Design an enzyme around this catalytic site. Structure first.
Site, short mmCIF file in Angstrom:
data_model
loop_
_atom_site.label_atom_id
_atom_site.label_comp_id
_atom_site.label_asym_id
_atom_site.label_seq_id
_atom_site.Cartn_x
_atom_site.Cartn_y
_atom_site.Cartn_z
N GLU A 165 0.83 -1.21 0.00
CA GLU A 165 0.00 0.00 0.00
C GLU A 165 0.89 1.30 0.00
OE1 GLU A 165 -2.95 0.36 -0.43
OE2 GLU A 165 -3.97 -1.50 0.14
N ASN B 48 -7.81 9.24 -5.08
CA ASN B 48 -8.66 8.29 -5.82
C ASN B 48 -9.52 9.02 -6.83
OD1 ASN B 48 -7.63 6.19 -4.12
ND2 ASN B 48 -8.98 7.06 -2.48
N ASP C 31 -12.66 9.07 -7.24
CA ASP C 31 -13.86 9.66 -6.65
C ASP C 31 -13.58 10.95 -5.85
OD1 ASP C 31 -12.80 8.63 -4.23
OD2 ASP C 31 -14.47 7.47 -3.72
N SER D 138 -11.67 11.10 -3.13
CA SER D 138 -11.22 10.79 -1.78
C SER D 138 -9.66 10.62 -1.91
CB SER D 138 -11.91 9.52 -1.29
OG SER D 138 -11.49 8.42 -2.09
N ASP E 93 -6.18 8.39 0.03
CA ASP E 93 -5.72 7.34 0.92
C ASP E 93 -4.46 7.92 1.60
OD1 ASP E 93 -7.61 5.66 -0.23
OD2 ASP E 93 -6.19 4.49 -1.32
N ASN F 229 -8.64 5.39 3.68
CA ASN F 229 -9.32 6.32 2.81
C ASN F 229 -10.21 7.32 3.50
OD1 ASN F 229 -10.06 6.72 -0.23
ND2 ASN F 229 -12.00 6.57 0.80
N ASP G 206 -14.85 -4.44 10.31
CA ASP G 206 -16.05 -3.88 9.62
C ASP G 206 -16.90 -4.87 8.82
OD1 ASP G 206 -17.61 -1.30 8.73
OD2 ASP G 206 -16.87 -2.04 6.79
#
Ligand SMILES: [Cl-]
Ligand SMILES: [Cl-]
Ligand code: NA
Length: 129
Positions: free
Chosen positions: A35, A46, A48, A50, A52, A59, A101
């Site tokens: 990562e 990203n 969209d 957003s 990271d 994110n 989650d």
């Protein structure tokens, strides 16, 4: 801070990540390698809008606040900049919430695509732990 491999392994272990939610330490090291290349200051935007952040590329759409991701949440209740610190505590604490989650480590696409099913043990081989 760019961690060494075994250095990050020992910091993750100290912070309670070994076998957390059943994921052995190598899974966590492998995910951080792909990562962020073990760099706490890694950031990636990203499509969209957003971003990271940090060693585990958490994110802003769901987990931290960066003030520039519309309609997102801050479930870890932290500014995304906390995830870039040389101290990994905030990234670890938030990652424990992410991995609990429902989808386990599949939340990290790089873990699913480059670590899941592989000999992750290799990532901690040799390290004093
Ligand atoms: Cl925002
Ligand atoms: Cl799981
Ligand atoms: Na957010």
């Amino acid at each position: 801070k760019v961690f060494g491999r075994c250095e990050l392994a020992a910091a993750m272990k100290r912070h309670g990540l070994d076998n957390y939610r059943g994921y052995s330490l190598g899974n966590w090291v492998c995910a951080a390698k792909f990562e962020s290349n073990f760099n706490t200051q890694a950031t990636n935007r990203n499509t969209d809008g957003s971003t990271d952040y940090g060693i585990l590329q958490i994110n802003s759409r769901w987990w931290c606040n960066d003030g520039r991701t519309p309609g997102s949440r801050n479930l870890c209740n932290i500014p995304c900049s906390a995830l870039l610190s040389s101290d990994i505590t905030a990234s670890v604490n938030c990652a424990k919430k992410i991995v609990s989650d429902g989808n386990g480590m599949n939340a990290w696409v790089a873990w699913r695509n480059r670590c899941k099913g592989t000999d992750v043990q290799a990532w901690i081989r040799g390290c004093r732990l």
